Amino acid sequence: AMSLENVAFNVVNKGHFDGQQGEVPVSIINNTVYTKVDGVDVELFENKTTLPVNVAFELWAKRNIKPVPEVKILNNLGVDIAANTVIWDYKRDAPAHISTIGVCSMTDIAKKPTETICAPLTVFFDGRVDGQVDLFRNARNGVLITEGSVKGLQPSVGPKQASLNGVTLIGEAVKTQFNYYKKVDGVVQQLPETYFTQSRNLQEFKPRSQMEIDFLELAMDEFIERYKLEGYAFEHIVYGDFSHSQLGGLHLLIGLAKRFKESPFELEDFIPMDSTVKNYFITDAQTGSSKCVCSVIDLLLDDFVEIIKSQDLSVVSKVVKVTIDYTEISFMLWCKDGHVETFYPKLQ
Amino acid sequence: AMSLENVAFNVVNKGHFDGQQGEVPVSIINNTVYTKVDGVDVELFENKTTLPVNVAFELWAKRNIKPVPEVKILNNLGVDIAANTVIWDYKRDAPAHISTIGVCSMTDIAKKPTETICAPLTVFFDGRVDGQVDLFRNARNGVLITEGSVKGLQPSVGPKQASLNGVTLIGEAVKTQFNYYKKVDGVVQQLPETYFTQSRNLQEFKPRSQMEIDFLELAMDEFIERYKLEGYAFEHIVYGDFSHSQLGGLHLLIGLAKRFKESPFELEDFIPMDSTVKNYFITDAQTGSSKCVCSVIDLLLDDFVEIIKSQDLSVVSKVVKVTIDYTEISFMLWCKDGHVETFYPKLQ
Amino acid sequence: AMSLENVAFNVVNKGHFDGQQGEVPVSIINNTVYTKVDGVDVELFENKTTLPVNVAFELWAKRNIKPVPEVKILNNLGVDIAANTVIWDYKRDAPAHISTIGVCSMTDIAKKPTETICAPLTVFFDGRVDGQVDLFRNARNGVLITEGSVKGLQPSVGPKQASLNGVTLIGEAVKTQFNYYKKVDGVVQQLPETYFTQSRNLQEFKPRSQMEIDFLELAMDEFIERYKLEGYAFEHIVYGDFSHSQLGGLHLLIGLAKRFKESPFELEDFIPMDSTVKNYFITDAQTGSSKCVCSVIDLLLDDFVEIIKSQDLSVVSKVVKVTIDYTEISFMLWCKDGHVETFYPKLQ
Amino acid sequence: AMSLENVAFNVVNKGHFDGQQGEVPVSIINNTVYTKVDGVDVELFENKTTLPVNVAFELWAKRNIKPVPEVKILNNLGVDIAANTVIWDYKRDAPAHISTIGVCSMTDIAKKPTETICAPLTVFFDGRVDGQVDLFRNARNGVLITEGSVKGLQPSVGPKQASLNGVTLIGEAVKTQFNYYKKVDGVVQQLPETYFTQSRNLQEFKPRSQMEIDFLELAMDEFIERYKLEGYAFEHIVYGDFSHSQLGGLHLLIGLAKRFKESPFELEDFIPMDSTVKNYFITDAQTGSSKCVCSVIDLLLDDFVEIIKSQDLSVVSKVVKVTIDYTEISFMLWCKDGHVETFYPKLQ
Amino acid sequence: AMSLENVAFNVVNKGHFDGQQGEVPVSIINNTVYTKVDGVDVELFENKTTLPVNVAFELWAKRNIKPVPEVKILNNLGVDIAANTVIWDYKRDAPAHISTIGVCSMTDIAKKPTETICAPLTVFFDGRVDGQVDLFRNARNGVLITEGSVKGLQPSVGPKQASLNGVTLIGEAVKTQFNYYKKVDGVVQQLPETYFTQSRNLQEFKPRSQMEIDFLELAMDEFIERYKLEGYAFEHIVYGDFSHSQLGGLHLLIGLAKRFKESPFELEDFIPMDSTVKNYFITDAQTGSSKCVCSVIDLLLDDFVEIIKSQDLSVVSKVVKVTIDYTEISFMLWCKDGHVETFYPKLQ
């Protein structure tokens, strides 16, 4: 018994869709869903998607409200659709996937993932939901997350963090660390050895290692000496060079975060989506130093230090490939006389 | 159990809302209601109203599909709302009234006309629906239509024609002639003696008397002589004068209809609504003769002949009041030396 | 080198997309595509689809401008997508299919039908285009049209008529009769023996047999006697009964066409799309006789006479299944004492 | 004292803007202007322009309601703006020019044409309005129309027809024939000798010469012999060839009009605007013969016969330039062995 | 080779338009430009302008990304258009000028500023671009900025600050101080002696003099004594009087900034645009003291102290004119018994 008024009833009385019986008066005007509360119209939903207003409304109401993998992770693993749930993309303010399985009717391609249309698609299964592990076992292509061991299957320990209602966090009262499994053309695939992005914010950055606590407290010169980072161009790559019209380096979030506490700058997020590498149009308010495409990655400093120290510095320019968030991230390594000049990620 | 998808289900399977259980997938995009029929979207409704798309959709689906009084009649009688039905205004392509009684959660002011909010409003009751006559008896203000006698109440025999799904007609297989009753501040009001407009179209004009048959076929001079209409300025009033830049007369629909068969002209209906007197911006293609506001009434010729002959021709200018469609229509009578110069209606 | 301005350049200079190099200034405002022609904006396209304006613009510009099968036929054969072309649905004023193959960067699911995503889809192939027959041979599911024989494949002779730029016609200067082939899960499927709808209009109806010439000119009683149709309820079924409030019969387009010449009526096409059986909300202007759902089929009278005479008249109510336009059309046959009472189609 | 409500007051009570004092309630919703008439909203204006709704509303209300030159003529003469009036483009349903002079606070570039911003623009002056002739004399660039002689200025006798409220006509009760004057960089320019298009419709075509009366009634062979048009390829050029998939010739409106009475066809007007040469996407219903770009001109047959007979038939291909509607129209003349093969206009 | 998809390609890969070859899939829905990134739509641009979505998209992509004069300065100098660049108005989130020169085609009036249409317009030239100084020399009307001396031309030293991607700043890594030149009807005009607004923000205010450091640190009474400002109504004019229902004074940004650190208030910016004088609807949260139109100027305190001390205090009310940002700013000076009562700017 699916309807617009029933979805709105659930939003008003439960906060989201909870399969409760009931209806409220709804009005649709210019990509917005309103409800009449005591003779006046209250806005329930504003559609920022490329889908019809009422359709997007239902998908939003039916979003997964338990901790879920971040969209970048899901994308990197090649997820096309989710089994009987909606992964909401809070960065895009729209559903993460086009179609659904047993969710919305206007977007459903199938009621169950066992339907043949799903066979060529990489279905996301959640081991926390009953029967989902068995469904992954019977699926041609799929990605599965679990909180524990799955008999016969070799896991891949995922990120420490996960997204709970658009809030990325490392769960204390909830489990956010999952086991990852992937199947391609009926065959369980061995997931690669990978680094993970920390998914932190520029304004309220939290150090997650002693090196990071030290980076923030200590000065450039002292930090570089303490962690013996001479000739690795750390000054340029992490802290950034603001002396010229064109901004130099600054490709590590912890560096932006340090600069931001001292002096604010403008970050124009021109491709607003969830991805491993982010590109920003940066303008530094203090100096006037700027850069159109500034690639920024959020790696735990210790991991970045490991990657840069694990490189051959004997060539002028070279593409370096690093497995981050289950995907291959191309870095551009520039050297001179056996020392780093610059090392930055590329968005692809 | 009212919902958007249930309304659409009824439209698709029954042609209108018929209280049948079921749901279809619906999508709302740019003031249009679409339904998915075998993987493609089919347009169910395009909103031309000032109401939200889904609201207007429900009202349209819930429109009265039996012969009903024409909007002009209902307006002239001072109708504000309808009891448990929707009178659809096919001229405006929108509901005839703003609010509803027991029809839609969004536009309802009340579930029943007995609710005190309805008391100051002129509620339309349909005696063909059970309990509606008793409801009119208990209403402070209202208008009632019936096919037969109502005990103790003095009727008013209405027009021969009525609107059936936007088609105005004189019913053969259905009854279109109703008895009219009106109440004001709890008191039954005596409805005036009145003439009725014929509600005909310019393109498919049908004469409804021998005089009308004679007008459309005989020459101007022949007709005037046959029906002894000398000095009544019929040539100017009914037929119209196209010899000057400004169009003369042409205030009777029959006249326009006669001209239209011979030579076409442009009628710009600048206030598109149902009314007793219609104003048009007329441009005659043949001559180039035009008029911004041209008042046109559709009275049976014999009725117009009766009105014009029942006038005192001894004054230069005079306002003449005629009860047409239960309302007072102001006519402007211009005379010279005991003969009519012009006699036109005024859209006031 | 695909772009908005290049598509518009082609529309302005060639009438549709013709792969010609060049660009014109374009402006997009309220679901309309405009072009600047000598300092003023001229409307190129108004979007009536559920797709983005520019996307729908490209699809319209890239529509098939050669005679193609009618959408009803393609739908009945279970067509999901077209190979390297756009079938434009002139009844819905939108593309016949959601996705495309090698047509538009925005709606393409694949560049070629050989891509595995196309495998589960019923792909329409046009044998008039080079390599398309071989592609049908290599496709898992598909429908193929050809003007001639295909080696090893058993044809199905399709309708005499086809759609050329929204004009349905039987080609004289062009070929409109095609050979039809269908494949399901890699296997060539034998298409059923079938009747075909004539795809005619109510207003410009053209008889296509001597029987049809006779129906439109002879009186009801004269025709029934000439073609010995006594006890087949043709009076009711084809001609229609307008004596009651509810309209009786009138299920054959020829019948409607006959009535329409004599007396006009309102046909409300509530599901506006191309289909074998059409449902209309009919209101007869003369009588006031009406029906919410009136199923109308356009079969050549002789074919209808063949179907009705080939039935067993010994049961009260029975579902009769007839293959029309490659699909199974359920008819409802009602009898009494060995004669037909009614025989109408069902839009299911 | 210009305002939205005052403009609407004028539309409702006068048919257009007439500088009358007063106001009505107005509501703007989805590119439409509504007015409240007895508790319900009536649509006054639907915006089909690229200008804001209220702005376009004012311009429409303030449109010139006297016979004016057709937009094609004004365009061909290089008109950029009008002096203290709005020329409404009824083909585009939008104002003919972007900016205004002393008309609307929103689109005005100046209050008077004497303002220096108007100097580089070709300003249209109407000699029927007081002081407009003197203003043309003081303007750097401009076009002037007059009903009579202008002292010292050499006239150009314009078309017999003019547009009165979107109705093109040859005035009987009004003057539609004007004298034309043009100035460029302060200098009066001599307007060329020219032919004029007849501005007729395909459906209601009226012959304007004995030759035209003869064309529409006589057989192709009979006409060619009567007017001695052998070897001029009139059969192909005017009448059109429908024997092949691609439509042959049919470049004269009279020809289309003749064909249309006998057998209807689809004319897709892909660039909907007023112009001397019109291009259509034609599909002939009877044959299936079609053409993407079909150039059609409406010249009086006698004028076309004069042009084609005044040509040298001794070359294979040649561009022929003809002054029609004050502009240079390029015709493509194709010959073989001293006879015409084809002669068509080019929409350039 | 200008196109929508090429502009989007540049935005995605370069951060703005950089004349790079390539195309991405684009979709336009409800005044927003989206791009398909790995099967999902990502928002590239939301149109807040009165221009068509795609047009505004191009102008935004083609905006000047080097430090430029602030819109208020450009406006005050009477700039109508920019030569081969787009000045983006970050306060209005729309282009600073209507038309363009050699930038966008739908907005271009000319390809070069040498075209005669540009002659009556005040063109902005940037001396940092090659050939631009020579173009200013040949222009009838224009404004030129340079980083250094221009032979023969007498400069006007402009503000210390300039706008870099909507960030107003005094450049350290870039030059923000320009030389200004202006030409009117071919004559180089001597620019006036002027004060400059500091273009600072209320929330992160930075003192730019010792007096300003002192204003913020010291208390009202002590500051007024230190800088001998008795009888100049500094308490009222700069710090503001919050004791009555109507807010007193507070017309200097440094005063709002001081109050804001202590106690926050609501500033309603009802005319959101860049201007020398700003008007706000202020409501003080602590007291409830408010003012509809509160004129606020951001002058360096020392400059304001200079202006107020340079006035004759011998009259009750007087209009005082001050050249700020190259324009004449009218101040209202109110006195009583030889001391200031109030002194505030006026927005015009």
PDB file of C-alpha atoms in Angstrom, chain C residues 10-16 27 29-30 32 34-35 37-44 46 60 63 65 67 164-174 206, chain D residues 31 47-50 75 89 92 94-98 242-245 264 266 268 270-273 279 281-290 292-293 347:
ATOM      1  CA  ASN C  10      21.574  20.981 -37.804  1.00  0.00           C
ATOM      2  CA  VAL C  11      17.902  21.598 -36.892  1.00  0.00           C
ATOM      3  CA  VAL C  12      18.027  25.184 -38.325  1.00  0.00           C
ATOM      4  CA  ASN C  13      19.945  24.300 -41.499  1.00  0.00           C
ATOM      5  CA  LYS C  14      18.852  20.691 -42.218  1.00  0.00           C
ATOM      6  CA  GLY C  15      15.448  20.190 -40.439  1.00  0.00           C
ATOM      7  CA  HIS C  16      16.868  17.523 -38.104  1.00  0.00           C
ATOM      8  CA  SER C  27      19.336  29.705 -24.948  1.00  0.00           C
ATOM      9  CA  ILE C  29      14.536  28.854 -20.576  1.00  0.00           C
ATOM     10  CA  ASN C  30      11.522  27.035 -18.998  1.00  0.00           C
ATOM     11  CA  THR C  32      12.195  25.320 -24.236  1.00  0.00           C
ATOM     12  CA  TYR C  34      15.513  28.947 -28.380  1.00  0.00           C
ATOM     13  CA  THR C  35      17.950  30.200 -31.067  1.00  0.00           C
ATOM     14  CA  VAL C  37      17.877  34.639 -35.382  1.00  0.00           C
ATOM     15  CA  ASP C  38      18.791  38.262 -36.248  1.00  0.00           C
ATOM     16  CA  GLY C  39      18.733  39.575 -32.640  1.00  0.00           C
ATOM     17  CA  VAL C  40      15.539  37.778 -31.507  1.00  0.00           C
ATOM     18  CA  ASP C  41      14.915  34.389 -29.943  1.00  0.00           C
ATOM     19  CA  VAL C  42      13.072  31.759 -32.017  1.00  0.00           C
ATOM     20  CA  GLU C  43      11.698  28.620 -30.395  1.00  0.00           C
ATOM     21  CA  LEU C  44      13.330  25.450 -31.798  1.00  0.00           C
ATOM     22  CA  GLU C  46       9.383  22.683 -26.366  1.00  0.00           C
ATOM     23  CA  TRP C  60      14.100  14.681 -31.175  1.00  0.00           C
ATOM     24  CA  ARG C  63      14.749  10.805 -34.564  1.00  0.00           C
ATOM     25  CA  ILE C  65      12.936  10.173 -40.444  1.00  0.00           C
ATOM     26  CA  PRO C  67       9.040   4.977 -42.369  1.00  0.00           C
ATOM     27  CA  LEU C 164       6.711   8.456 -41.446  1.00  0.00           C
ATOM     28  CA  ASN C 165       7.404  11.521 -39.258  1.00  0.00           C
ATOM     29  CA  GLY C 166       4.266  10.944 -37.215  1.00  0.00           C
ATOM     30  CA  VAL C 167       2.180  10.429 -40.360  1.00  0.00           C
ATOM     31  CA  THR C 168       0.784   6.896 -40.491  1.00  0.00           C
ATOM     32  CA  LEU C 169       0.419   5.788 -44.126  1.00  0.00           C
ATOM     33  CA  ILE C 170       0.589   2.962 -46.683  1.00  0.00           C
ATOM     34  CA  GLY C 171       3.628   3.971 -48.756  1.00  0.00           C
ATOM     35  CA  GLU C 172       3.394   4.561 -52.526  1.00  0.00           C
ATOM     36  CA  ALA C 173       6.713   6.393 -53.102  1.00  0.00           C
ATOM     37  CA  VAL C 174       8.256   4.507 -50.121  1.00  0.00           C
ATOM     38  CA  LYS C 206     -11.177   6.300 -45.340  1.00  0.00           C
TER      39      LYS C 206
ATOM     40  CA  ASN D  31       4.916  32.190 -16.449  1.00  0.00           C
ATOM     41  CA  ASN D  47       4.345  34.092 -21.417  1.00  0.00           C
ATOM     42  CA  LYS D  48       5.841  32.471 -24.542  1.00  0.00           C
ATOM     43  CA  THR D  49       8.762  34.968 -24.669  1.00  0.00           C
ATOM     44  CA  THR D  50      12.316  34.840 -23.276  1.00  0.00           C
ATOM     45  CA  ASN D  75      13.463  42.797 -40.446  1.00  0.00           C
ATOM     46  CA  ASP D  89       5.324  39.398 -33.412  1.00  0.00           C
ATOM     47  CA  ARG D  92       6.710  34.159 -32.497  1.00  0.00           C
ATOM     48  CA  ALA D  94       6.607  37.737 -28.495  1.00  0.00           C
ATOM     49  CA  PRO D  95       7.652  41.382 -29.094  1.00  0.00           C
ATOM     50  CA  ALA D  96       9.374  41.857 -32.476  1.00  0.00           C
ATOM     51  CA  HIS D  97      12.298  43.774 -30.840  1.00  0.00           C
ATOM     52  CA  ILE D  98      14.285  43.274 -27.574  1.00  0.00           C
ATOM     53  CA  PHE D 242       5.745  13.115 -55.416  1.00  0.00           C
ATOM     54  CA  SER D 243       6.802   9.952 -57.320  1.00  0.00           C
ATOM     55  CA  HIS D 244      10.095   9.450 -55.370  1.00  0.00           C
ATOM     56  CA  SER D 245      10.978   9.043 -51.645  1.00  0.00           C
ATOM     57  CA  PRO D 264      -3.405  16.786 -47.188  1.00  0.00           C
ATOM     58  CA  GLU D 266       2.293  17.546 -42.918  1.00  0.00           C
ATOM     59  CA  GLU D 268       6.694  21.034 -40.035  1.00  0.00           C
ATOM     60  CA  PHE D 270      10.983  24.060 -37.712  1.00  0.00           C
ATOM     61  CA  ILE D 271      12.050  27.789 -37.548  1.00  0.00           C
ATOM     62  CA  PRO D 272       8.666  29.394 -36.522  1.00  0.00           C
ATOM     63  CA  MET D 273       9.117  33.054 -37.415  1.00  0.00           C
ATOM     64  CA  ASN D 279      11.464  26.295 -44.951  1.00  0.00           C
ATOM     65  CA  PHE D 281       9.789  19.648 -43.381  1.00  0.00           C
ATOM     66  CA  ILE D 282       7.141  18.209 -45.685  1.00  0.00           C
ATOM     67  CA  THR D 283       5.663  14.669 -45.537  1.00  0.00           C
ATOM     68  CA  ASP D 284       3.000  13.829 -48.116  1.00  0.00           C
ATOM     69  CA  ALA D 285       0.335  11.565 -46.526  1.00  0.00           C
ATOM     70  CA  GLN D 286      -0.824   9.946 -49.805  1.00  0.00           C
ATOM     71  CA  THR D 287       2.554   8.897 -51.305  1.00  0.00           C
ATOM     72  CA  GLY D 288       4.956   9.023 -48.365  1.00  0.00           C
ATOM     73  CA  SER D 289       7.132  11.446 -50.408  1.00  0.00           C
ATOM     74  CA  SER D 290       9.112  13.783 -48.073  1.00  0.00           C
ATOM     75  CA  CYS D 292      13.595  17.970 -44.748  1.00  0.00           C
ATOM     76  CA  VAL D 293      14.161  21.477 -46.053  1.00  0.00           C
ATOM     77  CA  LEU D 347      16.480  30.569 -47.132  1.00  0.00           C
TER      78      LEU D 347
END
